[model samples]
Target: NLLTQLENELNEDTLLRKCSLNLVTVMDVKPLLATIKRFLTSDYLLDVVDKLVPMADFDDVLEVYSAEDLVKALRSEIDPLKVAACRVIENSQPKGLFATSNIIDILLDILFDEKVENDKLITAIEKALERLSTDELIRRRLFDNNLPYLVSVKGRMETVSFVRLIDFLTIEFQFISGPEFKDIIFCFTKEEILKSVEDILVFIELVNYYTKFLLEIRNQDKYWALRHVKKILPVFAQLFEDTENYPDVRAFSTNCLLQLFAEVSRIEEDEYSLFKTMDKDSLKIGSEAKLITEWLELINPQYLVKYHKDVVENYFHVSGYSIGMLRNLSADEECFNAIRNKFSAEIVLRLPYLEQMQVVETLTRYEYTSKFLLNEMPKVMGSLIGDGSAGAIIDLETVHYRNSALRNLLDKGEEKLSVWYEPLLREYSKAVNGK
Candidate 1:
């Protein structure tokens, strides 16, 4: 009853006098801050309480409560007060409250602060994800909630699980919600449809199919078996060579092929589909064949590391078109310096190690690149090899490749790229010995 009076007399001296000494007390401030937010002015739930926003220190009347109170509430000594602030922010009815302050910045900070691990607090943080506006989220690529990839990179982000990142990506891409996404996996089990699936210029259909195929493996319980859909892979891989396929279809096949190559390191005995197109040149893809090479992200350095007659690496490495294109790329000094100058500065600044690590690994792990790799190979390797997670280390599987890359790197780079280099290779060999 007394609170109703404060709301009704909001603009008057009565509102001011009542707020002075004992006008307000305890958690009743909750209802007043509740008054601070509104459904809006467009009439849906336009139960506008913005009257509270415009008033003064007299506005501080026990009569009015706003984000001022909520922000202040967040810092309270009492735990429930903090939780209370979160509850208000999480609501959809008073949605504008999002722009009203730094709620997310505060929430992300709460997520990282070790001593604040309250379940109620964490519960609000998780709930906050669902309440956000999404288009801007994807535009900024913040939809990945990148902290999940690092997990422990920032001490307490350990709870930012990969599952959470997958969920967020699902929300942004809206894949599970699409009708086309479901049947592609259904086709995985049925062999006939897999034989000739291109039932169009509806490029998005091709896009959705390939994109969801990749996303399916990253996470999701339903289409989990799609990862083993090797039968489907050959069909897509063959689409690369078939002249009947559209230019767009053939071009896209290259991306799918490279993606799958990264997916599996070792090739099976009967795996002929992968390298079938390797020995041949890509001149047919386009005039002078610039698209294929440029799209290779500067010849996908990994394809050349270790070339062999029947080896799977032949797909990108052992080729008239593959390494041939790279030679054309740096055949002249101007082009060589172009490769050296741009990529030199490129690798120097990028020690973060996602694809960059793979790029560095592929280059260092090769005979051809040795003379071109670097002179101070020791410095770069010690500086080059990086790993995932908070306290990163080179796991056993990576050691086979990473150590090999450096070994080949040490061999090749010694020719003309370096005056001298060795301990870097020896150190890694020791690091791998116990394994």
Candidate 2:
């Protein structure tokens, strides 16, 4: 056969020239491929494959070659040939060519192989895997083949690469179920907290992926996924409280814990395990009250006034257990002053009439109210009397116990209730009589 003759005279210049020319023709490259398979080292085969890769019928040649054959070429001791083998598969983008279990196995083998030193070859394999994973069937096959576990166990892979792989898989799949996703979360738990700052950052990125996964599910499924929170909360808390950790890590952990609180708050009151678990004495350091207080301390008062106006409103409204926590927190003058100072601005002065009334009612419960009332009354009194209806005065009487308490405090020693009330009496008289 012509192929037999071409192999026999591979060293002859004229025959080598003819073989190269014939290799590009639309006729069977498979025969020529077989013929060249015997005489050449992997380097020569790499040149042959690379030259053929761009031809129109190159995918046709790949159709006849088994994935095993492509994988064999991929496993070659020669690096360029391995890269070319990856390229040949990459260029053969049609379905069913590189989407086989065999191809997945081979690419994963190369990827997980610690001895594979060539970055180009590894990248080629990753690109091919990513392309192959585009098909839903192939993606499910990859997932079922324990692809996540394989990538996860390659702990020696560069941190960025590892995180990139996790990110790509999660984005592509987008809905890893609770049980399987738990395996991915457990991957980080096996190692000690990563020692290098870079490594910890990478680990935090992985944690963020888990957070996104949990948050994306429906409420029931999200609750199921977050059942793991109790166990992991301490880990995040430890990272947050450790000053040696990077500020980003601390901040991320704090935010993640806050997200957990927000989620728990939305759950039904009767389904109280999240609250019970969170409120346990051992977990007190990471409790929502403590964490929110920390957040309050960190955020600018003005920004809170604008961006977190609802939170500011809720804090002053002071209902439920949150109010009790605020009361206990107020026992520390520092905490009380911080809360008072944050809400003391004219911006806060414009709270809804009822909310403003609630703020006065709540502050009267605090022993430190004399100074707070003195500082805040000027800002609030205008709005208080300017909205003057008899109903407003009626509501003031409804809050008389709080009003009396504040007056009693103001009247201590030299200050008198009449001194404060006399001006209010004149203002009210003029307003009631339409001035």
Give all TM-scores, in the order shown.
Answer: 0.31, 0.42
Top candidate on lDDT is 2
lDDT of 2 by residue, 1-435 (tens): 366356655534554455556766744556555545544333345545555665737556665455777777766776765676676676665644555547666766676665667777777777666655656556655666755555454354467456555555555444445544544433345243444235665656656655554455433354554555445544544454455745666554556554544334334334445444443432343235545554443332333343344554455433333443444444444456545645554654665555555555555455565456655566554454445453345465434533443344444433433345664555445544545
Q: What's the distance in Å from true for residue 392, model 1?
A: 34
Number of the top candidate by TM-score?
2
- Note the Cα lDDT for every prediction shown: 0.41, 0.52
**Structure candidate 2, residue pairs in collision:** none
Model 1: lDDT equals: 0.41
- Superposed Cα RMSD, model 2: 18.2
| lDDT (C-alpha) at residue 16 in model 2 | 49
lDDT of 1 by residue, 320-384 (tens): 23434344333333333334533453444344433334445555544444446564244444455
